[PDB]
Design a protein around this ligand. Sequence first.
Ligand SMILES: [Zn+2]
Length: 246
Amino acid sequence: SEDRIKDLWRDFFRLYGYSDEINRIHQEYPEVRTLYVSFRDLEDYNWQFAGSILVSPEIYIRAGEEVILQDYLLDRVTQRFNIFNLRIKDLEEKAYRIRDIRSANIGTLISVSGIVRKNTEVFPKLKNAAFECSSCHGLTYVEQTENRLSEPQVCDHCGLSRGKDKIFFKLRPNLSEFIDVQKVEIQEDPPQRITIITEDDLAGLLYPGNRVIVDGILRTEQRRQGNIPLTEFFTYLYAINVRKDV
Ligand SMILES: [Zn+2]
């Protein structure tokens, strides 16, 4: 249950003394909107809960973020400004060579190490999209999670929908929230390669030659032979935490 997961986060933040840090972030939100939580603390709290985070990080991390937004930051949160990053650190004691990654790892939180070989420019990605209702001209915000734009079906202000009422929504970029994104390709230390997606506070940190360890969610991306959809995919890592060394 989502409610049960949120309840577990609520007790955790309090028990392990994160409330003070969160309240400090509160003073600087939304300019500051990231909290790092120690996996060592999570394990000490409830090792089943800790293990579940490794298996279903998107669901568990999102739940934690909701608790922070609803219970701690609410008076600084709006329909537009509702972004928060809950990140996990201190996973080093709890790792895969790039060549050892398999399909069984997809959707889970793993750690990968390598040398940075390439990076893209830092570019903006739509994160919280403002949509204007053709009827009442009110704004419905929709969080974006995919490469393709997710549009609303029903208006949050007047309750009409595209299907039954034939209304349409107009994207309003200037009223939307964007985040920085950067893709970084790493290679095994002599070798296979994998791409890491770094977003928001993690974008713009990695450069060619850097030795990195990245904790992230293993994702899949579809191969395309120009237009045509293939069943062949490749894996990439969505970064949750990044560490460098020389
Ligand atoms: Zn409307």
